[PDB]
Coordinates of C-alpha atoms and ligand atoms in Angstrom, one line a residue:
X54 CA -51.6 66.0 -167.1
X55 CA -50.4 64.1 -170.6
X56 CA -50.8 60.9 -172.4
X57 CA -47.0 61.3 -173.9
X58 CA -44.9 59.7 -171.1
X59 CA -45.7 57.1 -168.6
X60 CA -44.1 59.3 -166.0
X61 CA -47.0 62.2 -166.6
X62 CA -49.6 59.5 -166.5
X63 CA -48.9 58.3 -163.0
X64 CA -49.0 61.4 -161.9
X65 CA -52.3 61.9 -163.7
X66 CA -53.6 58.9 -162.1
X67 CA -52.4 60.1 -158.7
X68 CA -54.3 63.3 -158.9
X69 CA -57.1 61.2 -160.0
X70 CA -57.1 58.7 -157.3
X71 CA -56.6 61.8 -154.7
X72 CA -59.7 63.4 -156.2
X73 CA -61.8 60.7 -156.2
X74 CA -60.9 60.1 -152.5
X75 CA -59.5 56.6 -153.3
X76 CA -57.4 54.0 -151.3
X77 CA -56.3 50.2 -152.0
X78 CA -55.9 47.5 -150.6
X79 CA -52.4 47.0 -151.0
X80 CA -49.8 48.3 -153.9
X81 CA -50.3 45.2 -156.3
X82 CA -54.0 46.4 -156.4
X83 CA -52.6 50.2 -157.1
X84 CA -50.7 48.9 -159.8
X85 CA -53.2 46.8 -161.2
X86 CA -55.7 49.7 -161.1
X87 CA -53.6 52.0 -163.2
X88 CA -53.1 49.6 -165.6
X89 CA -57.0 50.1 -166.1
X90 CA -57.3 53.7 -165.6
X91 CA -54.5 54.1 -168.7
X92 CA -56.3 51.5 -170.7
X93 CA -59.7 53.6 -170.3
X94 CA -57.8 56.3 -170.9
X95 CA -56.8 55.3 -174.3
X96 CA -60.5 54.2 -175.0
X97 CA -61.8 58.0 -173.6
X98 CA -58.9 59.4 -176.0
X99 CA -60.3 57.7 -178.7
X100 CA -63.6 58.3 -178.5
X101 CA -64.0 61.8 -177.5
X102 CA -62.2 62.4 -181.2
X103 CA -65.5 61.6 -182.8
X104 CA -67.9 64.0 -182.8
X105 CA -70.9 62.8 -180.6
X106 CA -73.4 64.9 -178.6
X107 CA -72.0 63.5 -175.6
X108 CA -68.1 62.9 -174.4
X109 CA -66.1 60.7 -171.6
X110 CA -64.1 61.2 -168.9
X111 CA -61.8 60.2 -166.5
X112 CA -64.8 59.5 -163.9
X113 CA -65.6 57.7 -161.0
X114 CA -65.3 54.5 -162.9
X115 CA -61.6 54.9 -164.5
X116 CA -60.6 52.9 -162.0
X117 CA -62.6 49.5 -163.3
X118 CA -62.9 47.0 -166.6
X119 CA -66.1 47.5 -168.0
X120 CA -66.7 43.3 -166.8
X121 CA -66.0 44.2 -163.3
X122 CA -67.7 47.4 -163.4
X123 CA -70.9 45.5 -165.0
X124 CA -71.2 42.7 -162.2
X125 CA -70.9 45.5 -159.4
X126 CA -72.8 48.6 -160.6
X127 CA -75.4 46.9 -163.1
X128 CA -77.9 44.0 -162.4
X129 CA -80.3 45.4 -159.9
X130 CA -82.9 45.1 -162.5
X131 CA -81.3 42.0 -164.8
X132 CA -83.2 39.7 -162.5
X133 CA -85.6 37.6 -164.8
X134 CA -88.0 40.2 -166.9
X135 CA -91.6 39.6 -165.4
X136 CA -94.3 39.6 -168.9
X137 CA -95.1 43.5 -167.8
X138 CA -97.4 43.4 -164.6
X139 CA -100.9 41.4 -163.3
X140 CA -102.6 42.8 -165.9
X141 CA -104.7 44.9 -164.2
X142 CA -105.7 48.6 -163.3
X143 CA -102.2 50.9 -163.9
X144 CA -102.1 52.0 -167.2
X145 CA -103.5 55.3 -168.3
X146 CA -104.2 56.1 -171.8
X147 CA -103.8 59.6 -173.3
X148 CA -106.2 62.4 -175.4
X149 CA -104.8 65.6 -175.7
X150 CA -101.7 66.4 -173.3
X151 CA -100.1 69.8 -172.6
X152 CA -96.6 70.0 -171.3
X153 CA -93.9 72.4 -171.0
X154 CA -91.3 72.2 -173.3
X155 CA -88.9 71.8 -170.6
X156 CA -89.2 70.0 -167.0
X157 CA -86.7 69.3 -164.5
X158 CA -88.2 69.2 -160.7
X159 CA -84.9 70.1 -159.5
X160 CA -85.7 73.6 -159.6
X161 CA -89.0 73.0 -157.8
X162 CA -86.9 71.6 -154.9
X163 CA -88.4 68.3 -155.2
X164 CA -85.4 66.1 -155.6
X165 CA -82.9 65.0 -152.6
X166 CA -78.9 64.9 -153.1
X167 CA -77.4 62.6 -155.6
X168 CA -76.7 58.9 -154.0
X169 CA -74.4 56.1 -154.1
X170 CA -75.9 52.6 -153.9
X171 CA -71.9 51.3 -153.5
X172 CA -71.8 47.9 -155.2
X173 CA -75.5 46.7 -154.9
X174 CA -77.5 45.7 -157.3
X175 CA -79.8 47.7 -155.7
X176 CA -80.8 50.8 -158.0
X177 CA -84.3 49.7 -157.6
X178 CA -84.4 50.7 -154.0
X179 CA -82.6 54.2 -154.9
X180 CA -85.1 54.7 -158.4
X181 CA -88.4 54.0 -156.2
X182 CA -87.3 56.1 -153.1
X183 CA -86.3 59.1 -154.9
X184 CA -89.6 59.2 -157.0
X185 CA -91.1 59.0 -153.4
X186 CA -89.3 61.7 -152.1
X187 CA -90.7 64.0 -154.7
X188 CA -94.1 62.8 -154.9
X189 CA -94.5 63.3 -151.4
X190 CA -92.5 67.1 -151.4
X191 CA -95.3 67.5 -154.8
X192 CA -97.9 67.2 -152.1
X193 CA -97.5 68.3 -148.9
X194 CA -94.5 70.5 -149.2
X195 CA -91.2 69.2 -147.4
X196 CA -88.5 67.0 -148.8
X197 CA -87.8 64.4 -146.9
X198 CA -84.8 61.7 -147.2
X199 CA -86.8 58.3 -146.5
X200 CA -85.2 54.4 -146.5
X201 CA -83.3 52.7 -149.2
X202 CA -82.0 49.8 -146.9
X203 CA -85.7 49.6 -145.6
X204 CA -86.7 47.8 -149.4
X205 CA -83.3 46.3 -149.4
X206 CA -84.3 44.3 -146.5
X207 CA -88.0 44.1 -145.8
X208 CA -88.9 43.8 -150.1
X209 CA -89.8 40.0 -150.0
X210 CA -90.2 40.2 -154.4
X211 CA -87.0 41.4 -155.1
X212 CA -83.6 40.2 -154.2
X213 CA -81.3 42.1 -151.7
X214 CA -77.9 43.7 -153.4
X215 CA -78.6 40.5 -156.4
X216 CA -81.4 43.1 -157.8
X217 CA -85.4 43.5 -157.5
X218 CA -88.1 45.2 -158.8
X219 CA -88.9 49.0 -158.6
X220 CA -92.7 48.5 -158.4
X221 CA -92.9 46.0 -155.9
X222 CA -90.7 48.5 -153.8
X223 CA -93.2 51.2 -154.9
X224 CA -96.1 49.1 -154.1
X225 CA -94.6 48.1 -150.4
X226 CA -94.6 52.0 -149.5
X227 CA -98.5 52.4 -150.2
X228 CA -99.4 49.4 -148.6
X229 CA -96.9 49.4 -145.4
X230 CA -94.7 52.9 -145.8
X231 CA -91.5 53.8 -145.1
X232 CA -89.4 55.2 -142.7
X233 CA -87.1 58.0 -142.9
X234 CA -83.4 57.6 -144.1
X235 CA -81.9 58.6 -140.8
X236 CA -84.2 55.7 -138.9
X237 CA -82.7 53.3 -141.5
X238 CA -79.6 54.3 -143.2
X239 CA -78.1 52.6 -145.9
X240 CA -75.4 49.9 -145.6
X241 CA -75.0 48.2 -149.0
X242 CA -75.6 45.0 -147.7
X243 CA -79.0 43.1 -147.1
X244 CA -80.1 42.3 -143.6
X245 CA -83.2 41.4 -141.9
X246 CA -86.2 43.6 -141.6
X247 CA -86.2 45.8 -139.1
X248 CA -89.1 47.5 -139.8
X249 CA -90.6 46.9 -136.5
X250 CA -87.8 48.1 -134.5
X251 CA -88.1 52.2 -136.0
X252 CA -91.6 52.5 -134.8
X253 CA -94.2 54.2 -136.8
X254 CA -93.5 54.9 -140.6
X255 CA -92.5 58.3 -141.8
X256 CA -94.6 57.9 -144.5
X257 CA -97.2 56.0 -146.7
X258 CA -97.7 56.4 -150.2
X259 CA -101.7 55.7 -151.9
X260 CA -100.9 53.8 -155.0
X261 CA -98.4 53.4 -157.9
X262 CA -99.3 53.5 -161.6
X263 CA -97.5 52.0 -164.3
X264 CA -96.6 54.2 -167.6
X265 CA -97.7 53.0 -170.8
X266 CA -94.4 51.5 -172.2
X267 CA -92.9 52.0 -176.0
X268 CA -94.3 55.5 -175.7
X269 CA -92.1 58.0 -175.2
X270 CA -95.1 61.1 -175.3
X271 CA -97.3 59.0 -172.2
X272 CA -93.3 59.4 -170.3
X273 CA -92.9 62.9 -170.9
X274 CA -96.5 63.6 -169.2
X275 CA -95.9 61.8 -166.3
X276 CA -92.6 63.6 -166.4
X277 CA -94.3 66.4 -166.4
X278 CA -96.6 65.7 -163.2
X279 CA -93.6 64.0 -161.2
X280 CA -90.3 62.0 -161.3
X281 CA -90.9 58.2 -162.9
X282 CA -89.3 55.1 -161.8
X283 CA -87.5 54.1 -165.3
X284 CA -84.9 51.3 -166.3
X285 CA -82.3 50.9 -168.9
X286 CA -79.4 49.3 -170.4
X287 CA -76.6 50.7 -168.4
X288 CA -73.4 48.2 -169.1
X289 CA -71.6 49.7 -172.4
X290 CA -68.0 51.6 -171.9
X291 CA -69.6 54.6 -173.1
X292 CA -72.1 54.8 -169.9
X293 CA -69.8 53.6 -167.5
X294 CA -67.3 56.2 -168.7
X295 CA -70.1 58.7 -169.1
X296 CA -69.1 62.6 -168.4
X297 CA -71.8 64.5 -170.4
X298 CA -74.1 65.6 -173.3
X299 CA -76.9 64.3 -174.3
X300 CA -76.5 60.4 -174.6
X301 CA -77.0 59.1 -177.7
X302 CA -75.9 55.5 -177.2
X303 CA -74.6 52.9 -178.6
X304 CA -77.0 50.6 -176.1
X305 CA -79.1 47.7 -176.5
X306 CA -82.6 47.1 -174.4
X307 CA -81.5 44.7 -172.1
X308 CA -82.7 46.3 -169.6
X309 CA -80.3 46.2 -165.9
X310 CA -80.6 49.6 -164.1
X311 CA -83.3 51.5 -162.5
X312 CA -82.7 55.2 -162.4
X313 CA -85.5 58.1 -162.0
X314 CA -86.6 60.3 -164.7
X315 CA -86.5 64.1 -163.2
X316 CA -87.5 65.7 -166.5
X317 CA -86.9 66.7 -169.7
X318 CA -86.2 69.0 -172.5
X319 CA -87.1 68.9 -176.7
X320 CA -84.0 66.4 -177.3
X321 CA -83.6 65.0 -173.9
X322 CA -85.1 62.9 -170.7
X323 CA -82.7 63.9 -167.6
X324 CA -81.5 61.2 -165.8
X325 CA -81.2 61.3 -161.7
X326 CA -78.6 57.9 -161.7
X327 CA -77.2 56.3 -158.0
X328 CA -73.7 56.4 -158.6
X329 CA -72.8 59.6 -156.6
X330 CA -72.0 63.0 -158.1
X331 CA -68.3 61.6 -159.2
X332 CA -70.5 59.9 -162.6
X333 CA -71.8 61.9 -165.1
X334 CA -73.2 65.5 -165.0
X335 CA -72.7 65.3 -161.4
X336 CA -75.3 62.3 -161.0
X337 CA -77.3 62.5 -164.0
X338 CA -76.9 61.8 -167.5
X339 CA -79.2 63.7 -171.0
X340 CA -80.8 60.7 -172.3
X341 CA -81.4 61.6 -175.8
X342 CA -85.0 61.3 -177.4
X343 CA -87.3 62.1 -180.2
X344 CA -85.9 59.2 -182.3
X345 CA -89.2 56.8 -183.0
X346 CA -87.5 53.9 -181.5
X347 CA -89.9 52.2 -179.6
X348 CA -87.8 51.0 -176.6
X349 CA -86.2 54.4 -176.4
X350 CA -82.6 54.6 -176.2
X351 CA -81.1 52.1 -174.1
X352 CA -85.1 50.5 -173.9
X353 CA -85.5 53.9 -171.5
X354 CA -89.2 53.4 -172.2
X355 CA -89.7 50.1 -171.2
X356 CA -91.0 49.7 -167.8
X357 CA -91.6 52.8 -165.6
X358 CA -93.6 53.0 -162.4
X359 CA -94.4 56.3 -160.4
X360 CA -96.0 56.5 -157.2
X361 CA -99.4 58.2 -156.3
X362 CA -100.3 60.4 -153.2
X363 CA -103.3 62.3 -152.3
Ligands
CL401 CL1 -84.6 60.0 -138.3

């Protein structure tokens, strides 16, 4: 409503807290919160006077330090990077690829409705599942919601809410499968497998294949065929205070978020994230590309898994 009086502010904040459907624990927390929210807003102030291809916003995340919002929304990949996989069969090579000069399987009704993973480090579950989703609309025709809280418990190589891996999640859905979203909703919190409990999976995947990395052109045609499993470096301000344009950084590639790649265009990857539709471009975020940085920006091209179906 205006930065030039306190009074306008709270207000501001309010409205903000009211649209954002927000309540606190108690009034020393709504106090302490605002205090945030009008120190990010300074930052967003400052920074959207620039001139970038992207700009902030008062989003979901107004609310939170960029320290609190790191240990709660980042981390599900963080971990302790693996060397890059058993070395064996996943990699595919390239020769002479094809591919629209945009992609975006949005429009092929192939992606479900932007989720929140809460508090959880666990982005992998949310990354792997979607590109399941897809794969499995790509092939037999429906879209189907299937189990986030299914990896979260059952995935005995990753790590709960304190982070995992997107390919061993992948990998548990071709060997075991995976139950539908409704059988096993999501909670936010690890429990124990109860897998055996739901009966019969919904679904089984055939394989997964892993992308060759520091190459953004073998990305774009797996883009191109289906959604990837990707991770990045998602702890800066500037992402956590995201609201649109094509991201640019700054970012490093310490990799500590898994999101899923839904397509592209000439300057761009798009971006499905898990923070809800109150983050970004309503859930997603233009990752800029085309630079020759190896790691991509924000190491977006470091380890990316998709699954395979026949
Ligand atoms: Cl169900």
């Amino acid at each position: 409503n205006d930065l030039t009086s306190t009074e306008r502010l709270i207000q501001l904040f309010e409205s903000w807290m009211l649209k954002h459907n927000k309540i606190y624990k108690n009034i020393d927390e709504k106090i302490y919160r605002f205090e945030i929210f009008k120190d990010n807003l300074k930052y967003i102030d400052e920074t959207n006077k620039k001139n970038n291809s992207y700009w902030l916003g008062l989003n979901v995340f107004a609310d939170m330090s960029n320290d609190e919002f790191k240990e709660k929304y980042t981390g599900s990949i963080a971990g302790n990077y693996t060397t890059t996989e058993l070395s064996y069969e996943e990699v595919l090579n390239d020769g002479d690829v094809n591919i629209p000069e945009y992609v975006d399987w949005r429009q092929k009704g192939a992606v479900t409705p932007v989720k929140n993973q809460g508090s959880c480090g666990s982005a992998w579950a949310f990354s792997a599942v979607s590109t399941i989703e897809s794969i499995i609309k790509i092939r037999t025709g429906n879209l189907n919601e299937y189990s986030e809280q299914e990896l979260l418990d059952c995935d005995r190589r990753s790590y709960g809410c304190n982070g995992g891996y997107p390919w061993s999640a992948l990998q548990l859905v071709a060997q075991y499968g995976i139950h539908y979203r409704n059988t096993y909703p999501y909670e936010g919190v690890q429990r124990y497998c109860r897998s055996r409990e739901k009966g019969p999976y919904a679904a089984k995947t055939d394989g997964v294949r892993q992308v060759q990395p520091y190459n953004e052109g073998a990305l774009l045609y797996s883009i191109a065929n289906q959604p990837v499993s990707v991770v990045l470096e998602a702890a800066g301000k500037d992402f956590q205070l995201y609201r649109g344009g094509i991201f640019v950084g700054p970012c490093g590639n310490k990799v500590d978020h898994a999101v899923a790649a839904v397509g592209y265009g000439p300057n761009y990857i798009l971006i499905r994230n898990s923070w809800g539709t109150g983050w970004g471009e309503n859930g997603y975020i233009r990752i800029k590309r085309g630079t020759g940085n190896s790691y991509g920006v924000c190491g977006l091209y470091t380890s990316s898994f998709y699954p395979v179906k026949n």
